[PDB]
Amino acid sequence: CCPVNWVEHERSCYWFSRSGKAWADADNYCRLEDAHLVVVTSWEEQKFVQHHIGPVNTWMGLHDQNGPWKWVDGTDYETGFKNWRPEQPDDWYGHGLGGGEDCAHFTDDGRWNDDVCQRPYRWVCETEL
């Protein structure tokens, strides 16, 4: 029951961009497809997403723009799956672009990093069947 060009996996439909957008734009894009930026809640889901994105920085539906870490669909961050890269998240200001780092993305090895929301990265949308 996924739309055409979406990939079905464990009761979810995924769409993998082949272009980049700033996090807020990627967020708006997913919402307009009645979907959200991918919410990763298991090791199995992480591996599935990694397979399709490859070694490329890719936005996910996890951010801390208004304070504590939140998943875009309300999934609790504290008791949920996490796959941060060691020493991440670090809310780095050293990039000199203003602010810390408020948006999460999969890195080239799949592990997560918090980065500057304005960066154009590829993204993944997810909808639940």
Ligand X SMILES: Nc1nc2c(ncn2[C@@H]2O[C@H](CO)[C@@H](O)[C@H]2O)c(=O)[nH]1
Binding site, annotated residues for Ca(2+): 39, 45, 64, 88, 90-91, 101-102, 113-114, 126
The contact pattern for Ca ion, residues 49-68, with x = CB under 5 A and - = no contact, is ---------------x----
- Restricted to residues 54-93, the positions that interact with ligand X (CB under 6 A) are 88, 90, 92
Question: Cα dihedral sign for 109, 113, 49, 32?
Answer: negative
Give the per-residue SS3 of 4-39: CCCEEECCEEEEECCCCECHHHHHHHHHHCCCEECC
Strands 58-63 and 122-128: parallel
Annotated binding site: 39, 45, 64, 88, 90-91, 101-102, 113-114, 126
Contact indicator for 41, 80 with CB cutoff of 8 Å: yes
Question: Which residue in 6, 105, 112, 114 binds Ca ion (CB under 5 A)?
Answer: 114
- What is the smallest separation between the CB atom of 4 and ligand X, expressed in angstroms? 34
